[PDB]
Write a protein that binds this ligand. Structure first.
Ligand SMILES: Cc1cc(-c2cc(F)c3nnc([C@@H](C)n4ccc5ncccc5c4=O)n3c2)on1
Length: 288
């Protein structure tokens, strides 16, 4: 790595992000995750159980100083509902490996769809509140997620929910839900996107608020696909007919009212993540 190529203020932070190969064993024999940009494997860090992501499906990782800079930013994030970066390990043959905490119970969507798990309505709302707290933190860091959805949050061994799939962990972990734009070629999660982002492909924290509303709907339907009878970019036409996802059977009325505020046609009128934490914690507190 070329320390000179970095912003001079960040050079000190590199030692805290870089993991020496001696400190990490990767078990390439068993894939635990699959993304478009690469596979994920069990690993042991010095005995800390971790998830090691390869980026080898990409032809190139871009500018190495930029990759490092991304890693440094990501490493300073610390919140119990945000997936942390443990570090990055430089291997001789191949791209760098990204080292994340192991998430025993996988992604939130699959967890709520799992027949062997039986969360209550209170539990599902609490999963939503935990996501809201993670997003309030990210928004306070002026970080825009761009791909918030239940598939992109994960659960650890204590069922703590963590906003995942950002920074160096960013990928498409379920290709079904990404559609190619015709003018730009970008693969977009159209069914989670705000109206304005469908039009401009610009994403903001207020478009993350829209996605969060969809995520709440996923939770209360225990992982149903949103808008099944709508096809890809016909979602814009569908929404502009004056439509929204219907209230799920076991979704409390005030929680559906929160969903509708998250889908406000004017981005600036949608609630902040701080407001969502406040409103959801109240609704959650009414359940036993
Ligand atoms: C479906 C699905 C979703 C994911 C997923 C979603 C994320 F938001 C996400 N963020 N980071 C990851 C990768 C790096 N990851 C992280 C931890 C982990 N722990 C246990 C098993 C697999 C993983 C994993 O794939 N993710 C995988 O993997 N399969």
């Amino acid at each position: 790595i070329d320390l000179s190529a970095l912003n001079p203020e960040l050079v000190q932070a590199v030692q805290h992000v870089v993991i020496g190969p001696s400190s990490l064993i990767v078990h390439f024999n068993e894939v635990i995750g699959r993304g478009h940009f690469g596979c994920v494997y069990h690993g042991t860090l010095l005995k800390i159980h971790c998830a090691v992501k390869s980026l080898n499906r990409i032809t190139d990782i871009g500018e190495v100083s930029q990759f490092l800079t991304e890693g440094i930013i990501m490493k300073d994030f610390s919140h119990p509902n945000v997936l942390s970066l443990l570090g990055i390990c430089l291997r001789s043959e191949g791209s760098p490996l990204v080292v994340l905490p192991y998430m025993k119970h996988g992604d939130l969507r699959n967890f709520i769809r799992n027949e062997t798990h039986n969360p209550t309505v209170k539990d599902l709302i609490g999963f939503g509140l935990q996501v809201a707290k993670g997003m309030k933190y990210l928004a306070s860091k002026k970080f825009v997620h761009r791909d918030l959805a239940a598939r992109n949050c994960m659960l650890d061994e204590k069922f703590t929910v963590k906003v995942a799939d950002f920074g160096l962990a960013r990928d498409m972990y379920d290709k079904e839900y990404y559609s190619v734009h015709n003018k730009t070629g970008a693969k977009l999660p159209v069914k989670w996107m705000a109206l304005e982002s469908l039009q401009t492909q610009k994403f903001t924290t207020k478009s993350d608020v829209w996605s969060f509303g969809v995520l709440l709907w996923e939770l209360m339907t225990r992982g149903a696909p949103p808008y099944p009878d709508v096809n890809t970019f016909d979602i814009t036409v569908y929404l502009l007919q004056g439509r929204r996802l219907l209230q799920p059977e076991y979704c409390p009325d005030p929680l559906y009212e929160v969903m509708l505020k998250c889908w406000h046609p004017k981005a600036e009128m949608r609630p902040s993540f701080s407001e969502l934490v406040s409103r959801i914690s109240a609704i959650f507190s009414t359940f036993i």
